[PDB]
Amino acid sequence: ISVARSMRAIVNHNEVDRPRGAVAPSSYEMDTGTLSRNGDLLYSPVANGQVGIPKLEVDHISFSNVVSMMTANIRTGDDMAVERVNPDDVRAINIRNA
Amino acid sequence: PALLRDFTQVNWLNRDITNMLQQAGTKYGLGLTETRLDYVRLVKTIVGHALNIDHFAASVLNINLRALMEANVTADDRIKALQAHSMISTQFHGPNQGALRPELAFDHDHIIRCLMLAAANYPRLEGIIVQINTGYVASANVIRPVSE
Amino acid sequence: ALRPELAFDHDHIIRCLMLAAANYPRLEGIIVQINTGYVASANVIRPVSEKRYFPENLEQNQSAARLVSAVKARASEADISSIHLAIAREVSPMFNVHELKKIAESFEDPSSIVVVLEFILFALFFPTEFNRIKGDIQNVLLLFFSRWYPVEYGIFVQRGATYTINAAGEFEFSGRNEKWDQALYLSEHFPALFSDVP
Amino acid sequence: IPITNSNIFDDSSTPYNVRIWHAPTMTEVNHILALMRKSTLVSTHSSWHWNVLHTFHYRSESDMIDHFAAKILEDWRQKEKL
Amino acid sequence: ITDVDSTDYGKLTLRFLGTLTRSLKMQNAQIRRIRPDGTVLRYDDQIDI
Amino acid sequence: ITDVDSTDYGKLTLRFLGTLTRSLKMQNAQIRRIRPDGTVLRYDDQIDI
Amino acid sequence: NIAVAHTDHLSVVYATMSNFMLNFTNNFSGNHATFKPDQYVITSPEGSYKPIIERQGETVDGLTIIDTSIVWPILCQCTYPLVRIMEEIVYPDPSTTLSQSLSVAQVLSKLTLPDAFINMILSGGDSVVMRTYQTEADDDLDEGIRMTTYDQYLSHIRERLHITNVPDPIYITGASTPDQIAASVQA
Amino acid sequence: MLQQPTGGYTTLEQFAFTIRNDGTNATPTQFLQLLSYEATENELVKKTIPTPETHLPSARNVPGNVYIEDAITQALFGISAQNVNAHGYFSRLSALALPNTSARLGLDGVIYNSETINIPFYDPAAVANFAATYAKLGNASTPRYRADMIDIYAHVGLELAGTDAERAAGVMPVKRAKFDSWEGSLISLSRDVVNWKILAFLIDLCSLEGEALRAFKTRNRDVFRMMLFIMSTAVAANVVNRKVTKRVDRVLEYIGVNSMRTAGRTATITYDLSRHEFAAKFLQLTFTRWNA
Amino acid sequence: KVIFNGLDVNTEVQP
């Protein structure tokens, strides 16, 4: 029934080292990994020379991720100003040539 | 939860999380990580912050941004539409904002699809486009009604 | 006779001038203002009230109407400030690379030659500033040539719209027609119109 | 460039029109021909007069078929004597 | 659930298009030329975009 | 503290792009000629002062 | 009608303005065909790159764009002292433009200083961190083989070698006689 | 500065090219094993590739450090890249072409305008050797220097699908590649390959000589073939799937034939016209180098 | 007409 359960029994037991049935968070919740050149998210490489596993390749939930985001300098969707300049004489305009 | 490390009073949890974090395979972080300055202005543009967020939303946010930056279509390209909707041989100038003002490319394919579709569903669409063109003629001042 | 002051530190001053040039956008204007003031104080030139734009009769002449409207299109009203600036910037250091205020000229009517003279005069009164904006001038002159001297233009442009100088000093034309940008002013390329190679 | 019928008494719609292209390097020609696959009714000879690449553009597939058949008969008749 | 208002010109256009009966069946729909004869032509690289 | 008006320092004041702050950090910097490619040239007594 | 006013008067104004303290760049050599500006950057191994001349497009100052139409008033609608009938010529006191050049230079050194000063510190100055591994028993911490990271060498050592016109010091591979090292060190 | 080994930089485990597949990091060769073919009546015949132009486009005065690896790999395999030539920063590679330049090409794939601390970089000799050819990516778009977008793909076919016999003959039937596949296979492959540090492959391709180069070519044939594969899917006229008894086989028709398609589609990355020009140019250069 | 050292903008294009 508890398929959504990340953690359980965040308390100390006065006798035993950990309460029975206590559930630590999965390592995947905390592997921030890397944004890849593609924009695909990845977990950290498990051993040297390996690429990391894409986070979407697999069913674990990862709660730390690198989101790319534009800074104040980049702006988009602002209306843009220009000097429009009309033809000097309408009769001189060339509708035709290829 | 990786932030609970050495802060939670629950010992087993702190131990476990310390173990997971001390593994080679897993490393928590709270970006900024990747700065990217412009080639001309030399100021930062897109930056990679390692947020606490689900990988799905992050993947969608990144998909969108990747779209906007990889298009290599700056705001200057709006001029090309302006020329189309302008009298032949108008000139346009400035201001050459450059990479700093990116935009998505005009989606030709999808628009022509939606147009053919609507024209199928809504014949009255004809009267909309005509109306637009009518107004242009009306503003071009080519011909005026007269009493004579 | 001793002046009990520290020596002008030439070397340090040029260094700090260079750093300021790297980091302080206002530097350019500061220096210009100094120079402007000098011109303003030299009293070398003042605007007058009347304009001597056209020969007598030609302004009111009915067939002059296009050329008049051409000249009036270019001939801006005088201001002491803009004039003194124009004079001062011939001497002032440039930091942000200069750009021409782009002109849209088809060059259909003969009167369009105004723009050509507008550049020639600019090259005479202000050779320096002309030298900064000259490629941006070449973009306009190329329209003038293609429209007025199509065949010489095709030959010239077949040689290349620009060139680079090699280590031996010989010119090396691109062979390609490409529109100039001031982005190139700092590059190895030169507008080919100004090469003076026959 | 529109072409007229060789006969001048036949004042009727021209079957197609030739179109001179800027070329001149072989590469520019390649590129143009690659981009011509994107056009509608268009065809070219193996080589061109004035050494300037030029393509025929047809009003309709019938006109095109007639041009093709004509030129096929000319190549056939020519290779027959080659 | 997802209606989001228009811009005044879009209200004028939606009003102009009239009630959106949408009788057309869009299941697996495509854009294809008919022959004038009334048959549906296959897609043709070499003519359709 | 030294009563200097350091406004706009280390910044581009473009008319259209707005103000843009560049990094000021430049530890161990030198004045050096660049080739037009933009790459740095070694200092030369023959040309650089 | 105005050419004398240009050549025989305004030209001197250019000639003197050219000697002003703050007109430090070489703006133009008189030959359009070959002239290019000398181009400089502040730059560090640490990674800074700051061109003095750069192209950013139109600025707030209004100095970047040039209206060339300014030539028309200069011809067709401006009086000059020489034209016309006699008018006394003004020779400005040097002291004004000079003293404001000087005040500008002090404003500038005062302004760049905190930047220059902080960076002197972030640089870490004229010194480099250096491990000194020992090769013998009874070695003092001072004794042993000195060595440093490449980043320190780039940052503090190498520019000085470049600035002193000496060959770049030899790499040492497995096959390296001490005599080669001596030739390099003396080089 | 990273020393180049006696083999290329590619011998280093740091540069290993691997696509994710079957839940592991498969080497490109073990993925290419899944590839299978259906010859059609049509034939590919490889014409000689035109020699690349001598001209190296100017690396115009650029203050910034261009991210060239990202630019090339995205131009060739990136899902969303467009108008790749209008920015035209590939020219910048020519900055590295000079002997004793102050520029360095870092392992990040950035072209630094000057050497910089804590940024490891390829040996400037080798980068000069590589830039000497690949700066010509910069003139991919200039009309005088465009590469063929049609005939060059035959080589791609021959180098991918082509059996040793077909490759000897220089002609092969136009094939129809197919492999058992997971959902969105071509897209994940195109990203796994976009992530590659290909500049290692190129710098080694251009700097190595003799037996070292030959060993490089045999060692990396599958890497080259994989890049060729993503590219071939970008140009394939269509990509269907087939049901095959509770398995699904991805099927690209056809290998070695540029359909010149520029319309987007979900199955694979798409080449806008600029990407077609750039890729054709890249193929010209890389294939010219692959035969020596 | 009057001298102006800057782009003389008039149109404002929408995205």
DSSP string, B53-118: --HHHHHHHHHHHHHHHHT--BGGGHHHHHHHTS-TT-EEE----GGGSB-PPP-HHHHHHHHHHH
Rounded distance between C-alpha atoms, residue H115 and residue H104, angstroms: 6
Nearest CB partner across the interface for H87, out of B42, B72, B105: B72
Find out whether G133 and G147 touch, Cβ atoms under 8 Å.
yes
Written as one letter, the residue type at B16 is D
Find out whether A44 and A57 touch, Cβ atoms under 8 Å.
no
Supply H202's token pair: 């190129």
| DSSP 8-state secondary structure symbol assigned to residue G157 | I
Q: What is the DSSP string of G58-76?
A: SBTTS-SEE-GGGHHHHHH
Query: How many Cβ atoms are within 10 Å of C176's Cβ, its own excluded?
Result: 17
Rounded distance between C-alpha atoms, residue H115 and residue H120, angstroms: 9
Nearest CB partner across the interface for I7, out of B81, B94, B103: B94
C196: left (phi over 0), alpha (psi -120 to 50) or beta: left
Chain A residues near residue F16 by CB distance under 8 angstroms: 81
Supply F19's token pair: 């103000």
Report residue H164 CA to chain centroid gap. Answer: 21
Chain-chain contact of D25 with H143 (C-beta, under 8 angstroms): yes
Query: What residues does H220 pair with on adjacent strands?
Result: none
Count of all residues that appear for chain F in the document: 49
Resolution in A: 3.1
Rounded distance between C-alpha atoms, residue H238 and residue H255, angstroms: 11
Structure-determination technique: cryo-EM
N-terminal to C-terminal alpha carbon distance within chain G: 68
Rounded distance between C-alpha atoms, residue A79 and residue B54, angstroms: 33
Q: How far is CA B57 from CA A29, B64, C80, G84, H150, in A?
A: 14, 11, 60, 77, 40
Rounded distance between C-alpha atoms, residue B105 and residue B97, angstroms: 16
Rounded distance between C-alpha atoms, residue H254 and residue D80, angstroms: 37
Q: Name the phi and psi angles at A63, rounded to 5.
A: -95, 0
Find out whether A66 and B48 touch, Cβ atoms under 8 Å.
yes
Q: Which of D40, D43, D57 to mutate to test the interface with E (most CBs of E within 10 A)?
A: D40
- Nearest chain H residue to A45 by CA distance is H25
Interface residues of chain C, partner chain I, Cβ below 8 Å: 76-79, 82, 85, 101
H/E run at residue A85: strand A80-85
Query: How many Cβ atoms are within 10 Å of C62's Cβ, its own excluded?
Result: 5
Q: Is the peptide bond before G92 cis (omega within 30 degrees of 0)?
A: no
- Alpha carbon of C178: minimum distance to chain G alpha carbons (Å): 18
Chain F residues near residue G61 by CB distance under 8 angstroms: 13
- Comparing CA positions, the residue from D24, D23, D51 lying closest to residue D36 is D23
Find out whether H107 and H262 touch, Cβ atoms under 8 Å.
no
- Alpha carbon of A91: minimum distance to chain C alpha carbons (Å): 11
| DSSP 8-state secondary structure symbol assigned to residue C7 | P
Cβ–Cβ contact I3 with A under 8 A:
no
3-class SS shares of chain H: helix, strand, coil, % to 5: 45, 15, 40
Q: Which of G6, G61, G68, G103 to mutate to test the interface with C (most CBs of C within 10 A)?
A: G68
N-terminal to C-terminal alpha carbon distance within chain E: 35
Rounded distance between C-alpha atoms, residue B92 and residue A83, angstroms: 6
